[PDB]
Amino acid sequence: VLSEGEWQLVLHVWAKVEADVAGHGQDILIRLFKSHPETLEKFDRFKHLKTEAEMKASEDLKKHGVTVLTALGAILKKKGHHEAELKPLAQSHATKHKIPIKYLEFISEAIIHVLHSRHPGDFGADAQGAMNKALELFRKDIAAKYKELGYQG
Ligand code: HEM
Numbered sequence: 001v002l003s004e005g006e007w008q009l010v011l012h013v014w015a016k017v018e019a020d021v022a023g024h025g026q027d028i029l030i031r032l033f034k035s036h037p038e039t040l041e042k043f044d045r046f047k048h049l050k051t052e053a054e055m056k057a058s059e060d061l062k063k064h065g066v067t068v069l070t071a072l073g074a075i076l077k078k079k080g081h082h083e084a085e086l087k088p089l090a091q092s093h094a095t096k097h098k099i100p101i102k103y104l105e106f107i108s109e110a111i112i113h114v115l116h117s118r119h120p121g122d123f124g125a126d127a128q129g130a131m132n133k134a135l136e137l138f139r140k141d142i143a144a145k146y147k148e149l150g151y152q153g
Pocket residue numbers: 032038039040042043044045067068069071072088089092093097099103104107
């Protein structure tokens with residue numbers, strides 16, 4: 001679990017991300033779709049995007065970007081009791097979109113990759129440590145509802 005002090009740095013650096021939701025939303029995705037071209041093939045609305053130029057112009061991504069990073073916001077505030085924000089996401093993620101838990105790893109890798117970029121003196125080590133927990137945790141709760149519907153895979 002995250003201790004009081006552990007959620008506090010998380011909730012802290014996310015208070016910063018709050019500041020600007022969509023540009024953040026931006027990079028993260030470009031960092032999924034770059035490092036793991038496999039992810040891209042999931043998004044039926046985004047695969048025309050060959051290059052990374054194409055991929056920053058496109059305004060339909062940005063606003064997917066906020067969509068995603070809102071869903072993550074709410075889950076976080078609910079620190080550690082989020083088991084009611086999660087259920088919609090776990091459901092469609094398995095059944096509609098047919099996503100691997102391992103792409104929820106790739107994504108989780110890309111987030112942190114980018115709050116080290118856009119967030120020094122709060123996203124140092126100790127923040128990076130709790131942050132990775134609380135996503136670690138995000139996927140465990142996700143992964144376990146997957147088992148349930150039978151897509152631990
Ligand atoms: C922090 C990770 C993620 C979160 C919170 C997230 C959140 C959501 C939200 C709220 C939407 C719209 C509502 C819905 O369709 O259920 C969405 C759509 C979708 N998610 Fe995610 N998603 C996540 C991770 C992933 C991962 C990494 C992939 C792919 C490798 C993925 C692929 C999809 C797909 C393809 C859609 C359908 C897009 C469309 O046609 O509108 N998601 N997800």
